[PDB]
Design a protein around this ligand. Structure first.
Ligand SMILES: *[C@@H]1O[C@H](CO)[C@@H](O[C@@H]2O[C@H](CO)[C@@H](O[C@H]3O[C@H](CO)[C@@H](O)[C@H](O)[C@@H]3O)[C@H](O)[C@H]2NC(C)=O)[C@H](O)[C@H]1NC(C)=O
Ligand SMILES: *[C@@H]1O[C@H](CO)[C@@H](O[C@@H]2O[C@H](CO)[C@@H](O[C@H]3O[C@H](CO)[C@@H](O)[C@H](O)[C@@H]3O)[C@H](O)[C@H]2NC(C)=O)[C@H](O)[C@H]1NC(C)=O
Ligand SMILES: *[C@@H]1O[C@H](CO[C@H]2O[C@@H](C)[C@@H](O)[C@@H](O)[C@@H]2O)[C@@H](O[C@@H]2O[C@H](CO)[C@@H](O)[C@H](O)[C@H]2NC(C)=O)[C@H](O)[C@H]1NC(C)=O
Ligand SMILES: *[C@@H]1O[C@H](CO[C@H]2O[C@@H](C)[C@@H](O)[C@@H](O)[C@@H]2O)[C@@H](O[C@@H]2O[C@H](CO)[C@@H](O)[C@H](O)[C@H]2NC(C)=O)[C@H](O)[C@H]1NC(C)=O
Lengths: 139, 275, 144, 275
């Protein structure tokens, strides 16, 4: 029930970042331990968070014209991550006694924020047909 | 079934105050609690004490039996700061429903409804159904609601209170045939020269399956194709299938078809080559 | 010694603003009483401040390509205001006993910040060949 | 000559402490003080008392005489928090100097120099001259320094201290003839039809004077011209002079010249019209 979410619109990130203030903070509820733990442990959660963040981000811009505006890019990047939320919905496990502690609210620079975006995209690409049985613990 | 001491279907506890549930059963196993974000909190004790109860603990609690019986009680942990519980996105399939997850922590309020997040007017045919234990459900979702932001509203002692912005994202109910197009109808060159044909597929979702064919003896499929995709608009997806063959031969000649099929129908456009 | 500072690059402000977060705060030392007092009272000071702010603003972006990027526009808008600082240098009066109190440090949204930019540009256009006999007294707040 | 009681060329007072200057003269007029921002603070009293002296009061104080004589004394109001006085932009003409206005409030420091604002290396041919009473002057400014950010540094008791960012903006030394260009060399139409000719002027500054001429009996100047200017790059200025004549006639015919002159030379391009 999931087609091809990721598009070539992700190639416009470099342009987008260079067109956003490097000191502008984007709020994103970060899942503690994302760099160390394997994809499946945080992927679903992060995609939901990116979806929320990109939605809020888009609210900060206006649609001007044809030219590749920040609004344009952000809009499309939101579409991608939105589809991923539904594509992670069908693979959502049947939860039983699991309730660590919600994502920490953090703010990142555009550069940092989309680095997280890209990682999520990559972590989704190799999520399919990949060994993930590794139970998500502290290690 | 197990017997929960606070013998009532619904319980209103104040935020900050202690919250204790107890269920008596000789074959008791565990307590179960569904979080705002679909998660199950477990407790293997008869009595569940919650000191300084937080609004997030609002929800339904279920006492489980070893025989397979269950009894539940819904608890409201009332906090003046948090009248609505937020945190999740708003998704919804076309022609289906969309639950705006904004459950309340205070059921003693009136006019629990939806309103446009910026005070504007809601679509004429937009119909919603309130539910204190889950949120507000949007009935029959249409493509025209894509990108609608809403807010849950409720009147609390005369004054109005609003929740955070909920921006609805809708899934297109694929009910149309794809759209295929190719620049040239027919073209030919001599051997050695490489040729390239770009096929353009248009549809409302990314789910479309597109492919390039080589039909001479029978429609054969070739794997050497470059994929390119873009989101042109809300329900405007576009994929460009590029067929490239290096050093053309007598073997590589004939009619090529670009096939693309939906869960609804299918489309195709053919181009001719002779080398 | 002053040519034509203002260019058509100011027409890209609308685009620029729409391409900047509406909740992004740009720091600008604001001269108290700019909306009420006449141009000559704050013009020179504001132009200097805009020059500083646009310089800092540009530091927040990177030069990507040909396409009209925020870096491009901001760069050029800085050029304009920089020339105005020198064009206000030649008309700078011979100061005698004057030290009110430096500009207040404030932060504005892109929309607000460039509204101030535009006013400064306009206030410079009609600064030339204009009677600036009006006083710099706040009490005349009924607009003057 | 006026006699300033603090009989010393330089004085180092502490910030917060009282600062008093007194000059004795039968023909005394007023005291003068240059502010960081070129402003003259005046006092018509023999003794100038400054309670709780601020770092900003650093500078040279001059006692004025009715006969026309002057006597000055430089005062340093030491502040550990604010060592450098900062607030002004950084401008400089090409092949000239550029004063980085960052005077210090503490003369008792070593290694007072300029450094790249982000810690990088300064240009190889960049030469500067330190001066505690004014700042650090950049010698022989080039176009390659345009948009260079620097910081004033000084070692205070072993530790290093930096000032705020100073981003240099350089003025072009004009040493080239303007560049003029026109699309067509010659064109003609019948009466009534309107024609437009756009002249393109290029140069390193906005100071170029450009104009449109109508030379038949003699080079005449026309005021009906639309101006358009753009900053194409660091030293690339462009102006487009548009000549428009509504309802052409026999009177409006001949050779038109686009003249543009610098402070260096001048250029011109001619076009022909016959109606
Ligand atoms: C490529 O797309 C083509 C366009 O739809 C399509 O070609 C042929 O289309 C016709 C009409 O749509 C089909 O014939 C139908 O109608 C006839 C009466 O006119 C009936 O006898 C048939 O049973 C049928 O209902 C053809 O089936 C279809 N194929 C043919 C013969 O060319 C194709 O579906 C697509 N691929 C190709 C070229 O086969
Ligand atoms: C418009 O551009 C014209 C060319 O750049 C210029 O006109 C005259 O151009 C001639 C050469 O094309 C110059 O002639 C010089 O050399 C000849 C010898 O071959 C002698 O007449 C003199 O030595 C002369 O210096 C003219 O000097 C030059 N201008 C004159 C005096 O007619 C125009 O100057 C440009 N438009 C204007 C007048 O601003
Ligand atoms: C879109 O069509 C493909 C089928 O691809 C080819 O299948 C031939 C049998 C014939 O119908 C031809 O016209 C068509 O282009 C579906 O995908 C799968 O493709 C393989 C090819 O090896 C077939 O063997 C499968 O039967 C087919 N379906 C399965 C079981 O995956 C694809 O499903 C279809 N999209 C839909 C759902 O309409
Ligand atoms: C830049 O050019 C302008 C106008 O150019 C004309 O100047 C004439 C003197 C003559 O050389 C003619 O060929 C040329 O086209 C100069 O400005 C003034 O222009 C008026 C006419 O509009 C003349 O009457 C003035 O003499 C002339 N200068 C003065 C003294 O005002 C200008 O001098 C020249 N140089 C620059 C860059 O300023």
């Amino acid at each position: 029930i999931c087609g091809n979410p990721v598009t070539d619109n992700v190639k416009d990130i470099t342009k987008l970042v260079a067109n956003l203030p490097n000191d502008y903070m984007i709020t994103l509820n970060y899942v503690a331990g994302m760099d160390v733990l394997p994809s499946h442990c945080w992927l679903r959660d992060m995609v939901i968070q990116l979806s929320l963040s990109l939605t809020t981000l888009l609210d900060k811009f206006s649609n001007i014209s044809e030219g590749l505006s920040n609004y344009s890019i952000i809009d499309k990047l939101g579409k991608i991550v939105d589809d991923l939320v539904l594509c992670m919905e069908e693979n959502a496990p049947k939860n039983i006694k699991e309730s660590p502690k919600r994502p920490e609210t953090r703010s990142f620079t555009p550069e940092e924020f989309f680095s997280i975006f890209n990682r999520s995209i990559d972590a989704f690409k190799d999520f399919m047909v990949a060994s993930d049985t590794s139970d998500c613990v502290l290690s | 079934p197990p017997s929960i001491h606070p013998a009532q279907s619904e319980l209103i506890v104040e935020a900050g105050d202690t919250l204790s549930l107890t269920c008596i059963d000789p074959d008791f196993v565990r307590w179960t609690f569904k979080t705002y974000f679909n998660e199950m909190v477990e407790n293997k004790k008869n009595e569940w004490i919650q000191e300084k109860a937080e609004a997030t603990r609002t929800g339904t609690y279920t006492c489980s039996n070893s025989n397979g019986l269950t009894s539940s009680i819904y608890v409201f942990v009332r906090d003046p700061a948090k009248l609505f519980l937020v945190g999740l996105p708003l998704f919804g399939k076309e022609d289906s429903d969309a639950l705006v997850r904004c459950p309340l922590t205070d059921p003693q309020v009136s006019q629990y409804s939806l309103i446009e997040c910026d005070g504007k007017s809601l679509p004429t045919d937009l119909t919603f159904v309130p539910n204190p234990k889950a949120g507000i459900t949007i009935k029959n979702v249409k493509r025209a609601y894509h990108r609608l932001c809403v807010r849950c509203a409720a009147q609390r002692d005369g004054t109005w209170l609003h929740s955070d912005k909920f921006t609805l994202k809708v899934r297109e109910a694929i009910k149309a045939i794809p759209v295929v197009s190719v620049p040239e109808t027919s073209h030919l060159l001599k051997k050695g020269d490489t040729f390239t044909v770009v096929c353009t597929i248009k549809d409302v979702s990314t789910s479309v399956n597109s492919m390039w064919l080589k039909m001479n003896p029978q429609p054969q499929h070739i794997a050497q194709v470059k994929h390119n995709s873009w989101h042109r608009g809300d329900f405007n997806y576009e994929r460009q299938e590029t067929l490239t063959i290096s050093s053309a031969r007598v073997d590589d000649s004939g009619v090529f078809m670009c096939y693309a099929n939906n869960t609804f129908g299918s489309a195709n456009v053919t181009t001719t080559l002779k080398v």
